[PDB]
Design a protein around this ligand. Structure first.
Ligand SMILES: NC(=O)c1ccc[n+]([C@@H]2O[C@H](COP(=O)([O-])OP(=O)(O)OC[C@H]3O[C@@H](n4cnc5c(N)ncnc54)[C@H](O)[C@@H]3O)[C@@H](O)[C@H]2O)c1
Ligand SMILES: NC(=O)c1ccc[n+]([C@@H]2O[C@H](COP(=O)([O-])OP(=O)(O)OC[C@H]3O[C@@H](n4cnc5c(N)ncnc54)[C@H](O)[C@@H]3O)[C@@H](O)[C@H]2O)c1
Ligand code: NA
Ligand code: NA
Lengths: 320, 320
């Protein structure tokens, strides 16, 4: 049974991952942290082992690692695709420098370390249909650039020092509990809110821009599964994973068929569209399926149904 | 015509390019800077147009760009392949943070900016025969990882801000003036010194390990040429360029022809061998040839004859 450290824990992924790990391994085995404190309505308010730590504070990060002695780390802090174009200084500081600290500490303290990549690591030369694990990487956002740097530097730590570095290229992740940072796939979460609130959604991704996507339960499954796998089962450090692909028009159809209500949607092309246009439509994740058993339980309608049930309960929005 | 700032100007490439730029444009149009001062023996010693600047100091870097007002920048400082593996914190700071300040200044101050990349950006999935401009980048050195970053970041500045960023992936560069900075191809330069001193060469690279190489004069030509080209002539931001490939054994023979005398090399793998073996054997530089006229005037024996003459003159070793 591992001791698990999660950084950037109050975000979209960390919120749910923190809870899944605690319930799988017990709360005493799981320490989580973030640059800020949870608000009183955050799902991690009031839980112990939830610390304040700025990962840009090298010394603090090392003090926490020293004191807790994790055997696993999920290093989740990142400024994301859309926000990063607006705050590229912040993107480069966090995505480069925290990642560099997390790797050195993994090396120094003998930690199996997970740092997520993303479909944003790809750009327009990747081969957008069923994009492979190994291809040309020409990301067109600074976030993507820092993510390729992350894959490569982590892979360098594995080969140079034997650090057990593992990663997946996350597709767009959909969840109910905590709202998304500043990403291009955020529209997909926002559309469910808009539908429950009965208010017009202004969508900055164009209606037929397909992206790889996944629902959180599947994502959690896979984030635990790749960290549990014996290193000998892994043929690579970085794996594509996908759930299913969809476009905004498709998601809208899904939501409408579950609510039996039309939703008002105005499509604009914000920065999210030009970014998302540079990304794959779909991924090939067969290496992940084959090496460690990546699997997806949810399709789009099962996800919409769960999201429509959970958001009212978790956020108080207009229910049934 | 241009005003040219060179940073990292006192190293192997910067020494000769600084001189060539001054010749071409007038000493008044060229400002060269480095974190150290030239030593008494240095080709740039006691010249005007030679400043002291540490490029990690972002305000200092900006101060000098504000005072000099370049239209062109050659940003050369980097920790290289072999020295990087030994001192990776140093390599990560310089190669990532100085590049970042330099791009940021090129944007703010409307500067056409060159930052070299390298064959070290490639790794063992690149396709090592006539390696292409677009391919898999899996560098096995932190130097290489930082250079992929450099490529992608400069290109993102181009795409996002309209920064005129240009780069070549340099092969191993050979010259006599200033001794090399701790790369995997330094054995070449050192084999010339061994021969002239009639001492035994300890070569850390294996005898038949082919690598792309180029002799300086050709290199100086291309670096000025890619910077002269009208932007509309450029189809990309990053170009492979090569001179000719050689292995240590071919270089031995070329020194031997030129000296009409046996020269004694002992092959004893150091860290350079694994690094070099992960690199290309040869590069396809047809895009560079076609877009802006990359061209190569020396072959191996012309380089050796020139090198065996200049090293005694410039370093005061025994002659012919
Ligand atoms: N959610 C998705 O759709 C998605 C998709 C692909 C990849 N990812 C990756 O997963 C990771 C988490 O993403 P997310 O969606 O949870 O992001 P998020 O923005 O929802 O949360 C990021 C968390 O990091 C914390 N943080 C920021 N700076 C920090 C610092 N200096 N020190 C400590 N904590 C800091 C933030 O406060 C926030 O709690 C990132 O690496 C992201 O790139 C997410
Ligand atoms: N020499 C080659 O064969 C070769 C091959 C491929 C790429 N390159 C690239 O060309 C560039 C120059 O290489 P080089 O061989 O001339 O390296 P070098 O080691 O000879 O010179 C580097 C110079 O950078 C200076 N420097 C270091 N830190 C600095 C800082 N903070 N601020 C200002 N200056 C600093 C050093 O004083 C040194 O003079 C590098 O980016 C290198 O990667 C060189
Ligand atoms: Na997001
Ligand atoms: Na060198």
């Amino acid at each position: 049974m591992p001791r698990v450290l999660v950084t950037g824990a109050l975000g979209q992924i960390g919120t749910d991952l923190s809870l899944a790990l605690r319930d799988k391994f017990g709360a005493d085995s799981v320490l989580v942290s973030d640059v800020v404190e949870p608000g009183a309505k955050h799902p991690l308010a009031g839980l112990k082992g939830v610390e304040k730590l700025d990962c840009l504070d090298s010394n603090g990060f090392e003090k926490l690692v020293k004191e807790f002695k994790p055997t696993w780390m999920y290093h989740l802090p990142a400024i994301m695709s859309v926000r990063g174009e607006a705050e590229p200084d912040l993107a480069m500081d966090i995505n480069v420098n925290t990642t560099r600290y997390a790797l050195e500490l993994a090396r120094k303290y003998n930690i199996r370390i997970f740092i997520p990549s993303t479909i944003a690591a790809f750009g327009d030369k990747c081969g957008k249909t069923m994009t492979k694990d190994d291809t040309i990487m020409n990301p067109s956002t600074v976030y993507g650039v820092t993510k390729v740097y992350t894959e490569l530097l982590g892979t360098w730590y594995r080969q140079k020092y034997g650090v057990d570095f593992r990663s997946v290229r996350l597709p767009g992740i959909i969840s109910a509990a905590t709202l998304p940072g500043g990403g291009a796939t955020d529209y997909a979460i926002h559309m469910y809110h808009s539908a429950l609130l009965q208010k017009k959604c202004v969508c900055p991704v164009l209606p037929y821009e397909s992206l790889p996507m996944m629902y959180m339960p599947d994502t959690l499954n896979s984030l635990v599964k790749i960290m549990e796998a014996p290193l000998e089962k892994l043929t690579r450090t970085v794996y594509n994973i996908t759930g299913f692909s969809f476009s905004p028009s498709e998601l809208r159809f899904s939501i409408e068929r579950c609510t039996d209500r039309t939703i008002e949607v105005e499509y604009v092309e914000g920065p999210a569209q030009k970014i998302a246009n540079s990304w794959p439509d779909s991924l090939d994740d067969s290496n992940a399926r084959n090496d460690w058993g990546h699997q997806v339980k949810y399709d789009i309608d099962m996800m919409s149904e769960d999201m429509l049930r959970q958001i009212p309960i978790l956020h108080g929005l207009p229910s049934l």
